[PDB]
């Protein structure tokens, strides 16, 4: 039931599970001959690449966090902090 | 089943000492212990090789065909 | 396994040289780790060695009959008369180096059994083979080239790892996988599929 | 149950396992043949064709080869039959089912799988012979040993799938387990038993070896470290080289019974800048303990760095031991001649005691304690008498054991063995027991037909006086009876527990920490408003001491009170910079006062919660460490005064408490929950980061201190649970497992009781009411 | 069935040369020479001799895994001294002593009766 | 019994105290007895503690209990874990067993209950009274071979 | 083979416990683990 | 063995005697005094658990029927022969065991359960199960190439024909930490 | 002469107890190993069975044949089949022996290694001869036959080494001790009271001076002098195992030298 | 290029607590009664005993990979017999007009008590221990 970019209460920080799915999904696209938005310092493995697309906040993916009522909050991989 | 050719452990040929050993027992009326030493089998790796062997072939040969 | 409830699989074979050796030049046919002893309190094993050693030496059948007055002393006493340390230890040199081993070792002969069940008789390994006609799920046993059971318990673990995708890929894309057509009004698989 | 939630899946493999000391913790040795069978659908891509085509050419029966080639239309070109199997020009977009190669990620598990740790991702390492080869320190999580266990391997099939294994289920990632909130992988057998020896002060190594040991450690900086000794011979100590394994920045203080920054017993432990300063290295240091070099190295340097720590420590220690040797024989179970004398008679008196009780009892002189039959009291005595006997003859034996005694030698490392083992192998074995009682009268009024009716003497009812060494009919038979009782409930305590393990798992199955830090099941029905009541993840926790609960009232004061308005209890001018120009400042005392009034509220509050007086409680962020990690990151000298302003500290500590957060709603209700879930930690925090302390206890500086803060914040934020964490199961299992470890002062405990509980029985066997 | 042929212990296969010389990266004048189808016998003997040369700052070796018969010799020598030379010398000094022993033994063996 | 206790001087000391252990239960009437400290009276019979002191207390004992089972074995388990259990066992205001008589009745979709002890039946009494399964249980998405609200399936991913 | 020919089975208060009276008649040790432990005996 | 004290020439004694044994061994060498002869001349009896209830049994005959008129410190400790009642004496305690456990050396210097394990494994051991394995066509047969009688025997293996059809080899073992493999 | 120097004590067809002094332990060992594992030898490495009415299995018998020691002095002029340009084998890289035995008498006929019969052309090189040290001259007991049992074999002996297989070892057993008194302190004896009264005294002590009570610990001394003895299966005279040993090791070394060169 | 502490010590006790190549020595200082010493010494390479006159020296000179001979004809802070290298860890206030320090020579330990050392004693890793006659 949507929630404006404001009044956003969810964790600013990216959950491990979120990043593991983000990592997987981008790694998969990369494995399918998809454009790479990063400069390879000589990387070849999709995942290893996708990891580096995240390390340079260049992964055009957004996470939709459903709350338990039905509503949710859309966070962008650009916003989300990746400490871990 | 027949005397092992050579000792698992060290490799000292042993299969050429079974009959010798047996004789030393039966006729020379000697004890397994000395019989061994006389056959040049001085180390235990090479003493269990003969001392323990159970010459089963002698029982497999009694089977006619 | 020895005769004292101590089983073990081989973990590697070393050729005579790489093996530690006795000054006499004797080398072991087998080496077991000291750690499989304190806890299992399987002392007889140790004893049997003391005995079997003396025995092989003096060509005497070693009598490890139960309730007897056979002592670890009386035996150690016999083994010394045989020019060996009364307990089974014997200076040993490291095969690689030839140097002496800073720790003397329990060395002697011990009756060991060759149990059935050998790796090669077990090594099964499938990568999508024949499936059951009734469930369209992989078959059992390796004699049939079946699949391994990814039962209930394994699932829980995956769930615990939060690896949703993998799970789906395991309970579907591998084993059961089937496409069915449904009536958008009565969710029953009652839709005649005429693909053409 | 067996088709929908539990299926037989493809791309699985199983064989015998055996340990391999030259394999990395997170790898797994896959026997060439198995690798040649299991495959992986890789799509052709300009970043690979060369390798892919090259493999397709290698074919299905040479390792780095493949089977099957998938095309656009969905056809399967079978590479082992196919006039055109030596042809095939790969096309971008096609799929090349390739063999499993080195470094692939694979899910490796041992059953029963009552953990996450029972299933972990390992880097593939194709090798000869046919057994899965696994690193030893991966042993315990799977609870394997190499007496024949077989293990199952599964191969990810999707690019995502792989990622899910390598990022969530990787062995590295699992070293510090959330269940025991400590690590779940230590150092065992040889590496442990050895590392200890290799450490003894008496242990020195020289050139030739040193150079090998160093080289042996793969991450060696090739810089030979200067010998501990340079005199008549340049000798290095054990610690010396082992320290090479330990990376830099690792610190670790210990203190066992008699430690004293000079540990005459080479006790406790002291590791600074990744250099072992003092203390023998054994289980407590390198085991899978809480404080452990592993718990610390995982948290500090990273999972992977710590993953490596294992192999290194191993490679070095193993090598060292490979050349020192170690063994055990009967000899190691023989006790000093005069000792067996002292032991045999140690028992001789125990028997006389039992006898003297017995005669007393038979005279009806005995005074029955309350609630017990004069008969009950009788038995209990003798049993106590005999147990002590065993334990002292045992202790008596343990003392002989010379440090050179291999058994004792393993016990000291903590690599196998315990008092009991020695005590039984060397001195008296003990009183046998079936159903918690000493052997019964299976025959009429007697134990065996070799005794006379009515004979409660120790020999008669199961007291095995002899040792496994000396040797044990009646005794035998008896000890056998107990033996059996054991094997039996052994078979039972397994099924009953197996069942419980499930009911727990089904019951909680669907419970997980949602995105509002709440804990609800499928229905949405809230179960916990904050997980674990602090919304903190179990793994990121450690037993810390709340320094404000204990100590005399005087000591609590001698420690935290700062009264600038009091020449005798003010901050000496050597500690603080503004020492002299503070003495008297009333505006400052108003703060110290405010700080000190809080610490005292906390003392009360805590003593209210933890009535026990127990001050050691698992809390996120090991503050003590952060401090030590500033103590030498900024090289802080305990000789010059700090540049800290009383305002800095006090106001800083306070402010820190504002940026911890676990919830972020801007409303009252939630803003109050957030306060709750942090109260305790904060208490820890305040008692630790107190003005005196900061200044007098660990001479911080505006820089160090300022760092320590920014630090805590981050860590805290890292210790929070992640929405998704499936706590339902995670818990169910965390209870089921340690439950299947249970197998055995007159109450109903263990499995039965746990069963009693979970079922919510009303017919409990051991009811009781405890009044005060 | 997963056992490798015994001869792979002393027979170089395809694309396998007796030695590979890569320059160590951690230290200077350092080199890691990998040996193929060779075990402790050589490795340790050459390691020991290589440690008689006073212009040798380091020298260790390891069979990274028993399964395979190969090992690594690491060498670091005094500026201007090429370890390959430090290696050459060693092998020689070794052969020489060996020859020697061969003779002296053969001598004695001949003064023997039996 | 042994009980640590704050001494006037501040330090915790050991002030042993007499305590009566009982071989039989009747909480309701013993608290009322004089001399005893009704504040501390206890029982391992959580049910009774429930009926008498309320459920929030029952939860307590329920844990205090489980805990003892696990710790009497020297073994430790983080609070949260057992907490969750007890709580899950205690949210429905009563003492709900880990048996089928308790949590399978729960209010959950048919399929979950399916995977536990009374499949057949559960599915009938479920068909008879047209139950609608949300399909939000992990156990059901497993039956339909779909991702579930697990780590990987809680948040949705989009372009 | 000898051991199989000298075996004993007991279908279905405490029956798998090695019992006093067993002395002299049934082997105190020989018996299978788990499952039928104590039920299958050996003379 | 029976014990009936009926013996004018001093105390209570086992009916069997050295006399009868030379007579028993007499028969062995000829390979007329059987086991039934001992049973008939009433020197032995067959007792079931029920009658066992009413008898007193000495373990070792010797060590249990001499009169008490220095002790080897390495021998285990045994109590005493306290009983002017013995009606029977055990043929030999080692007999309380059966086939499987019978092949364990010193199982009386071994922790209870480990004896049970071994007994279950002796049945998975290889060796010659029968000298005619070559003439028998049966589902799987495993035979040892060079079976060895154990250097460590049991006075009860002679009847279990172990030494004749051994299952196991006499390997030179070393308990030592070596390659860590 | 130069460094390394020997001092034979005993000597015969089979053994050679000798003192090897002024050498490095590393070498004493390298030598020892090589003797055990890399000196070449001729041994049956392929058995073609024509008839086996025996009580033993084919491969069981084949295994034993391989183990039977064969002459190997001139093995240095016999090639490795894998290097001979022939297809399979020839008289340049092998030696073929025939075994034919028939149970004739009803009194059990024994089959000894003395019955192998060289069929190939030795080419005048001492090679492949059932080695016999028996007293009666019946080297090794291969098999026994009954009434009318047959055994008709054809073996092909090839050049090989202890590494591919132990049957190819000429060495048997090698004694080896150094520093009889633990002056070098390369060990720490295990004791119960006096490690000196409990641990035996090696013959080798007699050939060395004791430790001299109050003398400090000789921390600079290394291992010189080694008391070895090479037993010999016999395919090679003992003197040779020692020589060929020394040789081989020496060649191994040289090939690395030759390596750098081609590099 | 320095020296940091010189002083002759008189050994009062020599303790070998279950070690055969190490003894923990405690010798008092000749001259200033204030100074005392606790040290771990390899009695195998450098014996010691009841009342010996030991000369001690600390310094920090005669950290790049260790080398060995050659210099056998070069530098030589070999004017002593026994020598060790180590890392010092904690400086403590024995209180009063005295102060102590702790060094660890790869596990071999030493505690030094006095006061004028506030200057002469380092504050870092470097620290050799030289003893003679
Ligand atoms: Mg197991
Ligand atoms: Zn031998
Ligand atoms: Zn419809
Ligand atoms: Zn040819």
From Swiss-Prot, chain A:
Q: Which GO terms describe its biological process?
A: nucleolar large rRNA transcription by RNA polymerase I; ribosome biogenesis; RNA-templated transcription; termination of RNA polymerase I transcription; termination of RNA polymerase III transcription; transcription by RNA polymerase I; transcription by RNA polymerase II; transcription by RNA polymerase III
UniProt subcellular location: Cytoplasm; Nucleus
Q: Which GO terms describe its molecular function?
A: DNA binding; DNA-directed RNA polymerase activity
Q: Which UniProt keywords apply?
A: Cytoplasm, DNA-directed RNA polymerase, Nucleus, Phosphoprotein, Ribosome biogenesis, Transcription
Query: Where is region (Leucine-zipper) located?
Result: 40-61
Q: Which GO terms describe its cellular component?
A: cytoplasm; nucleoplasm; nucleus; RNA polymerase I complex; RNA polymerase II, core complex; RNA polymerase III complex
Give the similarity note: Belongs to the archaeal Rpo6/eukaryotic RPB6 RNA polymerase subunit family.
Q: What is the annotated quaternary arrangement, including any partners?
A: Component of the RNA polymerase I (Pol I), RNA polymerase II (Pol II) and RNA polymerase III (Pol III) complexes. Component of the RNA polymerase I (Pol I) complex consisting of 14 subunits: RPA135, RPA190, RPC40, RPA14, RPB5, RPO26, RPA43, RPB8, RPA12, RPB10, RPC19, RPC10, RPA49 and RPA34. The complex is composed of a horseshoe-shaped core containing ten subunits (RPA135, RPA190, RPB5, RPO26, RPB8, RPB10, RPC10, RPA12, RPC19 and RPC40) where RPA135 and RPA190 form the DNA-binding cleft.
Other remarks on record?
Answer: Present with 6090 molecules/cell in log phase SD medium.
UniProtKB/Swiss-Prot annotation, chain C:
Q: What is the annotated localization of this protein?
A: Nucleus
Annotated residues for binding of Zn(2+):
183, 186
Residue ranges annotated as zinc fingers (C4-type) are 183-196
Q: Which domain of life is it from?
A: Eukaryota
Leftover remarks: The binding of ribonucleoside triphosphate to the RNA polymerase II transcribing complex probably involves a two-step mechanism. The initial binding seems to occur at the entry (E) site and involves a magnesium ion coordinated by three conserved aspartate residues of the two largest RNA Pol II subunits. Present with 18700 molecules/cell in log phase SD medium.
> Main role?
DNA-dependent RNA polymerase catalyzes the transcription of DNA into RNA using the four ribonucleoside triphosphates as substrates. Second largest component of RNA polymerases II which synthesizes mRNA precursors and many functional non-coding RNAs. Proposed to contribute to the polymerase catalytic activity and forms the polymerase active center together with the largest subunit. Pol II is the central component of the basal RNA polymerase II transcription machinery.
Tell me its family: Belongs to the RNA polymerase beta chain family.
Listed under subunit, the entry gives: Component of the RNA polymerase II (Pol II) complex consisting of 12 subunits.
Name under which the protein is recorded: DNA-directed RNA polymerase II subunit RPB2
Instruction: Please report the organism this UniProt entry assigns to the protein.
Output: Saccharomyces cerevisiae (strain ATCC 204508 / S288c) (Baker's yeast)
From Swiss-Prot, chain D:
The known PTMs are summarized as: The tandem 7 residues repeats in the C-terminal domain (CTD) can be highly phosphorylated. The phosphorylation activates Pol II. Phosphorylation occurs mainly at residues 'Ser-2' and 'Ser-5' of the heptapeptide repeat. The phosphorylated form of Pol II appears to carry, on average, one phosphate per repeat. The phosphorylation state is believed to result from the balanced action of site-specific CTD kinases and phosphatases, and a 'CTD code' that specifies the position of Pol II within the transcription cycle has been proposed.
Q: What is known of its domains?
A: The C-terminal domain (CTD) serves as a platform for assembly of factors that regulate transcription initiation, elongation, termination and mRNA processing.
Shown stretch of the complete protein: 337 to 1119 of 1733
**Its domain of life?**
Eukaryota
Q: Binding of Mg(2+) 1: at which residues?
A: 145, 147, 149
Which parts of the sequence are annotated with region: Bridging helix? 473-485
- Organism of origin is Saccharomyces cerevisiae (strain ATCC 204508 / S288c)
Tell me which family the UniProt entry assigns to this protein.
Belongs to the RNA polymerase beta' chain family.
**What is this protein identified as?**
DNA-directed RNA polymerase II subunit RPB1
Q: Where is this cross-link: Glycyl lysine isopeptide (Lys-Gly) (interchain with G-Cter in ubiquitin)?
A: 359
Q: Where in the cell is it found?
A: Nucleus
Report residues binding Mg(2+) 2. 145, 147
From Swiss-Prot, chain J:
By its UniProt entry, which InterPro entries does this protein fall under? NA-bd_OB-fold (IPR012340), RPABC3 (IPR005570)
Recorded GO MF terms? DNA binding; DNA-directed RNA polymerase activity
Which keywords accompany this UniProt record? Acetylation, DNA-binding, DNA-directed RNA polymerase, Nucleus, Phosphoprotein, Ribosome biogenesis, Transcription
Residues found modified as N-acetylserine: 1
Q: What else is known?
A: Present with 6210 molecules/cell in log phase SD medium.
Protein known as: DNA-directed RNA polymerases I, II, and III subunit RPABC3
- Chain's role: DNA-dependent RNA polymerases catalyze the transcription. of DNA into RNA using the four ribonucleoside triphosphates as substrates. Common component of RNA polymerases I, II and III which synthesize ribosomal RNA precursors, mRNA precursors and many functional non-coding RNAs, and small RNAs, such as 5S rRNA and tRNAs, respectively.
Q: Which SMART domains match?
A: RPOL8c (SM00658)
In its UniProt entry, the species of origin is given as Saccharomyces cerevisiae (strain ATCC 204508 / S288c) (Baker's yeast)
One of its GO biological process terms is:
transcription elongation by RNA polymerase II
Family assignment?
Belongs to the eukaryotic RPB8 RNA polymerase subunit family.
Q: List localization entries.
A: Nucleus
The region called Non-specific ssDNA binding is annotated at 15-38
- GO cellular component terms attached to this protein's record: nucleoplasm; nucleus; RNA polymerase I complex; RNA polymerase II, core complex; RNA polymerase III complex
Task: Output the lineage of the source organism.
Answer: Eukaryota, Fungi, Dikarya, Ascomycota, Saccharomycotina
| One Pfam family from the record | RNA_pol_Rpb8
Q: Which gene encodes it?
A: RPB8
């Amino acid at each position: 039931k949507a929630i404006p970019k404001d009044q956003r209460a969810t964790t600013p920080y990216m959950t491990k599970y979120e990043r593991a799915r983000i990592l997987g999904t981008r790694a998969l696209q990369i494995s399918m001959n998809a454009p790479v938005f990063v400069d390879l310092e000589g990387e070849t493995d999709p995942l290893r690449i996708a990891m580096k697309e995240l390390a340079e906040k260049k992964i055009p993916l957004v996470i939709r966090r459903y709350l338990p009522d039905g509503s949710f909050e859309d966070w962008s991989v650009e916003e989300l902090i990746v400490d871990l | 089943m027949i005397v092992p050719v050579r000792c698992f452990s060290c490799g000292k040929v042993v299969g050429d000492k079974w009959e010798s050993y047996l004789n030393l027992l039966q006729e020379d009326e000697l004890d397994e212990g000395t019989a061994l030493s006389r056959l040049g089998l001085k180390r235990y790796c090479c003493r269990r090789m003969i001392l323990t062997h159970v010459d089963l072939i002698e029982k497999f040969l009694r089977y006619n065909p | 396994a020895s005769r004292h409830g101590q089983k073990g699989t081989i973990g590697i074979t070393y050729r005579r040289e790489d093996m530690p050796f006795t000054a006499e030049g004797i080398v072991p046919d087998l080496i077991i780790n000291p750690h499989a002893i304190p806890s299992r309190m399987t002392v007889a094993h140790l004893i049997e060695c003391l005995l079997s050693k003396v025995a092989a030496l003096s060509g005497n059948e070693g009598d490890a009959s139960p309730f007897t007055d056979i002592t670890v002393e009386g035996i150690s006493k016999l083994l010394r008369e045989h020019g060996y340390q009364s307990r089974g230890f014997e200076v040993m040199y490291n095969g690689h180096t030839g140097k002496k081993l800073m720790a003397q070792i329990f060395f002697g002969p011990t009756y060991y059994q060759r149990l059935r069940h050998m790796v090669d008789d077990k090594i099964h390994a499938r990568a999508r083979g024949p499936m059951q006609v009734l469930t369209r799920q992989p078959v059992e046993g390796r004699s049939r080239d079946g699949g391994l059971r990814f039962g209930e318990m394994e699932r829980d673990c995956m769930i615990a790892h939060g690896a949703a995708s993998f799970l789906k890929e395991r309970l579907m894309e591998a084993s059961d996988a089937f496409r069915v057509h449904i009536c958008g009004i009565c969710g029953l698989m009652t839709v005649i599929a005429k693909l053409n | 149950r067996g088709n929908l939630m539990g299926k037989r899946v493809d791309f699985s493999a199983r064989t015998v396992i055996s340990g391999d000391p030259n394999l990395e913790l997170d790898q797994v040795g896959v026997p060439k043949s198995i690798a040649k069978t299991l495959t992986y659908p890789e799509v052709v891509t300009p970043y690979n064709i060369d390798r892919l085509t090259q493999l397709v050419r290698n074919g299905p029966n040479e390792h780095p080869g493949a089977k099957y080639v998938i095309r656009d239309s969905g056809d399967r070109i079978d590479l082992r039959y196919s006039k055109r199997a030596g042809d095939i020009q790969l096309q971008y977009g096609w799929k090349v089912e390739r063999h499993i190669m080195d470094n692939d990620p694979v899910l490796f598990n041992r059953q029963p799988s009552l953990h996450k740790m029972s299933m972990m991702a390992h880097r593939v390492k194709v090798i000869p012979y046919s057994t899965f080869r696994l690193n030893l320190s991966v042993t315990s999580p799977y609870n394997a040993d190499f007496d024949g266990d077989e293990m199952n391997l599964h191969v990810p099939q999707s690019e995502e799938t792989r990622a899910e294994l390598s990022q969530l289920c990787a062995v590295p990632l699992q070293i510090v387990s959330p269940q025991s909130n400590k690590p779940c992988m230590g150092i065992v057998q040889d590496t442990l038993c050895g590392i200890r020896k290799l450490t003894l002060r008496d242990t020195f190594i020289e050139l030739d070896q040193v150079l090998n040991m160093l080289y042996w450690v793969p991450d060696w900086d090739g810089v030979i470290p200067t010998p501990a000794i340079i005199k008549p011979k340049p000798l290095w100590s054990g610690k010396q080289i082992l320290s090479v394994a330990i990376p830099n920045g690792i610190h670790l203080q210990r203190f066992d019974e008699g430690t004293t920054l000079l540990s005459p017993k080479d006790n406790g432990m002291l590791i600074i800048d990744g250099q072992i300063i003092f203390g023998v290295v054994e289980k407590k240091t390198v085991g899978s303990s809480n404080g452990g070099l592993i718990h610390v190295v995982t948290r500090e340097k990273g999972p992977q760095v710590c993953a490596k720590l294992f192999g290194n420590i191993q490679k070095v220690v193993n090598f060292w031991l490979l050349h020192n040797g170690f063994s055990t024989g009967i000899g190691d179970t023989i006790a000093d001649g005069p000792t067996m004398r002292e032991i045999t008679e140690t028992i001789a008196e125990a028997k006389k005691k039992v006898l003297d009780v017995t005669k007393e009892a038979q005279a009806n002189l005995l005074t029955a304690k309350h609630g017990m039959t004069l008969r009950e009291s009788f038995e209990d005595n003798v049993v106590r008498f005999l147990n002590e006997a065993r334990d002292k003859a045992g202790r008596l034996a343990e003392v002989n054991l010379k440090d050179l005694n291999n058994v004792k030698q393993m016990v000291m490392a903590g690599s196998k063995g315990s008092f009991i083992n020695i005590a039984q192998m060397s001195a008296c074995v003990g009183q046998q027991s079936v159903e918690g009682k000493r052997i019964a009268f299976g025959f009429v009024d007697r134990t065996l037909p070799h005794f006379s009716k009515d004979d409660y003497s120790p020999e008669s009812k199961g007291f095995v006086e002899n040792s496994y060494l000396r040797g044990l009919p009646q005794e035998f038979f008896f000890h056998a009876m107990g033996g059996r009782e054991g094997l039996i409930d052994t078979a039972v305590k397994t099924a009953e527990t197996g069942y419980i393990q499930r009911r727990l798992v089904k019951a909680l199955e669907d419970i997980m920490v949602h995105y509002d830090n709440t804990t609800r099941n499928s229905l949405g029905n809230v179960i916990q408003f904050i997980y674990g009541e602090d919304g903190m993840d179990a793994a990121h926790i450690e037993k810390q001491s709340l320094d404000t609960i204990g100590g005399s009232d005087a000591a609590f004061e001698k420690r935290y009170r700062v009264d600038l308005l009091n020449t005798d209890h003010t901050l000496d001018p050597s500690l603080l910079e503004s020492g002299s120009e503070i003495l008297g400042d009333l505006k400052l005392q108003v703060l110290l006062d405010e700080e000190y009034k809080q610490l005292v509220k906390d003392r009360k509050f805590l003593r209210e919660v933890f009535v026990d007086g127990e001050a050691n409680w698992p809390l996120p962020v090991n503050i003590r460490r952060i401090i030590q990690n500033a103590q030498q990151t900024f090289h802080i000298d305990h000789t010059k005064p700090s540049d800290l302003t009383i305002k800095d500290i006090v106001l800083g500590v306070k402010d820190l408490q504002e940026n911890l957060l676990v919830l972020r709603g801007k409303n009252e209700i939630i803003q109050n929950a957030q306060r709750d879930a942090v109260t305790l930690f904060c208490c820890l925090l305040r008692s630790r980061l107190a003005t005196r302390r900061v200044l007098q206890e660990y001479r911080l500086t505006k820089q160090a201190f300022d760092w320590v803060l920014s630090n805590i914040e981050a860590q805290f934020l890292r210790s929070v649970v992640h929405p998704g964490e499936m706590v339902g199961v995670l818990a169910a299992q965390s209870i089921g497992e340690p439950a299947t470890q249970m197998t055995l002062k007159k109450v109903t405990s263990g499995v039965p009781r746990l069963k009693e509980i979970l079922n919510v029985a009303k017919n409990m066997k051991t009811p009781s009411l405890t009044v005060y | 069935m997963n056992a490798p042929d015994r001869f792979e212990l002393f027979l170089l296969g395809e694309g396998e040369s007796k030695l590979k010389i890569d320059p160590d990266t951690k230290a200077p004048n350092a080199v890691v020479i990998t040996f193929e189808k060779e075990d402790h016998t050589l490795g340790n003997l050459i390691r020991a001799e290589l440690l008689n040369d006073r212009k040798v700052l380091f020298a260790a070796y390891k069979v990274e895994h028993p399964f395979f018969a190969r090992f690594k010799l690491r060498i670091q020598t005094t500026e201007g001294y090429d370890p390959k030379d430090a290696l050459k010398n060693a092998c020689n000094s070794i052969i020489n002593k060996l020859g020697a022993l061969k003779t002296n033994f053969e001598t004695e063996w001949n003064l023997q009766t039996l | 019994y042994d009980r640590k206790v704050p001494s006037p001087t501040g330090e915790y000391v050991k002030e042993p105290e007499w305590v009566l252990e009982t071989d039989g239960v009747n909480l309701s009437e013993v608290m009322t007895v004089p001399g005893i400290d009704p504040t501390r009276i206890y029982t391992n019979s959580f049910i009774d503690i429930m009926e008498v002191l309320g459920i929030e207390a029952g939860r307590a004992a329920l844990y205090k209990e489980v805990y003892n089972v696990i710790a009497s074995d020297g073994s430790y388990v983080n609070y949260r874990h057992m907490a969750l259990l007890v709580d899950v066992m205690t949210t429905q205001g009563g003492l709900t067993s880990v048996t089928r008589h308790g949590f399978n009745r729960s209010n959950t979709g048919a399929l979950m209950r399916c995977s536990f002890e009374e499949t057949v039946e559960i599915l009938f009494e479920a068909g008879a009274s047209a139950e609608l399964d949300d399909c939000r249980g992990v156990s059901e998405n497993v039956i339909l071979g779909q991702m579930a609200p697990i780590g990987t399936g809680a948040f949705d991913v989009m372009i | 083979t000898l051991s199989h020919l000298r075996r004993t089975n007991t279908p279905i208060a405490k029956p798998r416990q090695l019992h006093n009276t067993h002395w002299g008649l049934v082997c105190p040790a020989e018996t299978p683990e788990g499952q039928a432990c104590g039920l299958v005996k050996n003379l | 063995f029976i014990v009936e004290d009926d013996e004018s020439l001093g105390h209570k004694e086992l009916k069997v005697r050295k006399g009868h044994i030379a007579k028993l061994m007499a028969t062995e060498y000829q390979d007329e005094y059987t086991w039934s002869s001992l049973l008939n001349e009433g020197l032995v009896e067959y007792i079931d658990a029920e009658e066992e209830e009413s008898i007193l049994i000495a373990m070792q005959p010797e060590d249990l029927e001499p009169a008490e008129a220095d002790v080897d410190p390495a021998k285990r400790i045994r109590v005493s022969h306290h009983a002017t009642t013995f009606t029977h004496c055990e043929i030999h305690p080692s007999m309380i065991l059966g086939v499987a456990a019978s092949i364990i050396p010193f199982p009386d210097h071994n922790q209870s359960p480990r004896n049970t394990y071994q007994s279950a494994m002796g049945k998975q051991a290889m060796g010659v199960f029968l000298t005619n394995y070559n003439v028998r066509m049966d589902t799987m047969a495993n035979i040892l190439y060079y079976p060895q009688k154990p250097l460590g025997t049991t006075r009860a293996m002679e009847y279990l024909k172990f030494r004749e059809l051994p299952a196991g080899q006499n390997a030179i073992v070393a308990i030592a930490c070596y390659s860590g493999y | 002469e130069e460094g390394p120097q020997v001092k034979i004590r005993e000597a015969s067809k089979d053994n050679v107890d000798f003192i090897l002094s002024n050498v490095d332990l590393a070498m004493a060992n390298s030598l020892r190993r090589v003797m055990i594992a890399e000196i070449p030898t001729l041994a049956i490495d392929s058995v073609e069975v024509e008839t086996n009415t025996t009580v033993l299995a084919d491969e069981f018998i084949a295994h034993r044949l391989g183990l039977i020691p064969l002459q190997s002095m001139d093995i240095e002029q016999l090639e490795y089949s894998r290097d001979c340009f022939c297809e399979d084998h020839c008289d340049k890289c092998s030696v073929v022996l025939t075994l034919q035995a028939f149970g004739e008498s009803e009194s059990t006929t024994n089959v000894y290694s003395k019955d192998l019969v060289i069929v190939s052309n030795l080419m005048g090189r001492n090679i492949g001869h059932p080695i016999i040290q028996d007293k009666e001259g019946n080297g090794v007991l291969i098999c026994k036959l009954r009434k009318g049992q047959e055994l008709k074999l054809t073996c092909v002996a090839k050049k090989g080494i202890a590494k591919e297989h132990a049957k190819w070892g000429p060495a048997a057993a090698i004694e080896f001790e150094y520093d009889p008194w633990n002056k070098l302190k390369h060990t720490d004896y295990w004791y119960e009271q006096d490690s000196a009264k409990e641990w035996p005294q090696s013959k080798n002590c007699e050939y060395e001076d004791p430790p001299n009570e109050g003398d400090p610990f000789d921390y600079k001394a290394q291992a010189d002098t080694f008391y070895m003895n090479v037993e010999s299966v016999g395919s090679i005279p003992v003197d040779q195992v020692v020589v060929r040993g020394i040789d081989t090791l020496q060649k191994k070394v040289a090939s690395i030298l030759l390596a750098l060169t081609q590099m | 290029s320095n020296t940091l502490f010189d002083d002759i010590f008189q050994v009062s006790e020599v303790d070998p607590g279950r070690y055969n190549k190490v003894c923990r020595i405690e010798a008092a200082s000749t001259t200033q009664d204030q100074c005392k010493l606790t040290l771990d010494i390899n009695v195998e390479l450098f014996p010691v005993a009841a009342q010996d006159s030991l000369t001690v020296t600390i310094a920090s000179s005669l950290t790049r990979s260790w080398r060995p001979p050659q210099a056998g004809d070069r530098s030589l802070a070999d004017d002593y017999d026994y020598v060790m290298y180590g890392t010092a860890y904690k400086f403590e206030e024995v209180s009063k007009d005295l102060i102590a320090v702790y060094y660890s020579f790869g596990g071999l330990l030493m505690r030094l008590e006095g006061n004028y050392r506030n200057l002469n004693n380092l504050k870092q890793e470097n620290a050799y221990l030289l003893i003679r006659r």
